[PDB]
From Swiss-Prot:
Binds 1 Fe(2+) ion per subunit. Residues 136-302 form the JmjC domain. This is Lysine-specific demethylase 4D. One of its GO terms (biological process) is cellular response to ionizing radiation. Fe cation binds at H182, E184, H270. The gene is KDM4D. The keyword Ubl conjugation applies. It comes from the Eukaryota. Histone demethylase that specifically demethylates 'Lys-9' of histone H3, thereby playing a central role in histone code. Does not demethylate histone H3 'Lys-4', H3 'Lys-27', H3 'Lys-36' nor H4 'Lys-20'. Demethylates both di- and trimethylated H3 'Lys-9' residue, while it has no activity on monomethylated residues. Demethylation of Lys residue generates formaldehyde and succinate. 2-oxoglutarate binds at Y126, N192, K200, K235. One of its GO terms (molecular function) is chromatin DNA binding. The chain holds residues 11 to 341 of 523 of the full protein.
Amino acid sequence: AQNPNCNIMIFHPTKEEFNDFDKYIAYMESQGAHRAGLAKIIPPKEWKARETYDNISEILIATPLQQVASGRAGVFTQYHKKKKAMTVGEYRHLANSKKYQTPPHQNFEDLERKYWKNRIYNSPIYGADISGSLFDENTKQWNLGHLGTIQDLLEKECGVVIEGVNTPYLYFGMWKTTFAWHTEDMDLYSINYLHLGEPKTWYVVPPEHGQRLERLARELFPGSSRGCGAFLRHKVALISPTVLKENGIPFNRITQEAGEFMVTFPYGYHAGFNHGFNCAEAINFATPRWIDYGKMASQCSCGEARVTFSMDAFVRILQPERYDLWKRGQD
Ligand SMILES: O=C(O)CNC(=O)C(=O)O
Ligand SMILES: [Mg+2]
Ligand code: NI
Ligand SMILES: [Zn+2]
C-alpha cells in the first residue's frame, strides 16, 4: 500500500503533466496521496493563473463575516456576524490596519504558536464564499473555472442526468481568519489555489481515521452533538493541534503559499487559518473513486447546515433513503 503513514505529499508536475487534470489526480492517488486527506501541487514554472493582480480592488465582498469565538484557546466555536459590504481594496486596507494586521514573528512555527494562543481574543473579518474566478480565460491548465462538472461525472459514472451547476468561489482572508473542521459537501474533493498574499496553514485528518475526529468532537462539543448527528457540517468547531495530540488523533499540517494548489480528498477532515491578507479560489470536484464516498456521506438534517441548490440532486440520487429527512432540513 502506498503512503501507509498517510503523510501529506507534495507534487511538482511538469508542464506536460499539467495538461490533463483528471489524469494527474489519478497519478497522485496511485502514489498514495489521498491517504493523507490533503496534497500540495506546485505548478510548473512556465504556468501562471493570470498576468497580474493589479486590478482586483473593485471586486465586492457583499457580506463580510466577522468570526467571533467562544470557548477556550484550543477548543472553541465560531459564529459569523454579517458586516456591511466593502470592496476588496477596502478589505485589504482593513486587513493591514493596526487592529487586524499580522504581528511580528520569526517563522511560520512562531506564527502558528501565536495563532493558537491568541485567536479566541480577536474577531477577524473573512470575505468568504464569493462566487467568481480570478483565472484568466486563456489559462488552459488547472483553471478552476474550467473543470469537468460533478453533474457530468455522476452522469458519466452512473448514467443519470441531473440538474445543477458547479462554479468556483473566492475567499479574501486576513490574519486569524479561520476555517473550521469539516469535510466537503457530500464528501467531495476540493481544490484550492492561493492566488496572492500571505500563507494559509492547513491541518488534516486521514480519511481512514475521520471517525476518530468525529468521536472526539462529540466529546468536546457535547450540546452540539445532541442537537445534530452531523454537527461538523455546520462548520463552526475548532480543535488545536495540541488537543488533537493529547487525544491521540492522527493528523498532519502544512503551510500553503501564494502560487500553490491544495487538493482535499473525499472524507478528509481539514481546518486552518490565514497568516495575513490573501485571496484564494476553490471549487469542489469529483472522480470515479468519489462515488462510494458520496453514497456514505453523513448529513445534517437539523437545519443548520443549509447548502447549495446542486446538493439536492446528489442526495436524491446517491442517498434516496435520506432524501426526505435531509430536504426537510433544507426547507
Ligand atoms: O480557504 C478556506 O477558507 C477554506 N477552504 C477549504 O475548506 C477548501 O478549499 O476545501
Ligand atoms: Mg476590480
Ligand atoms: Ni474545505
Ligand atoms: Zn445539523
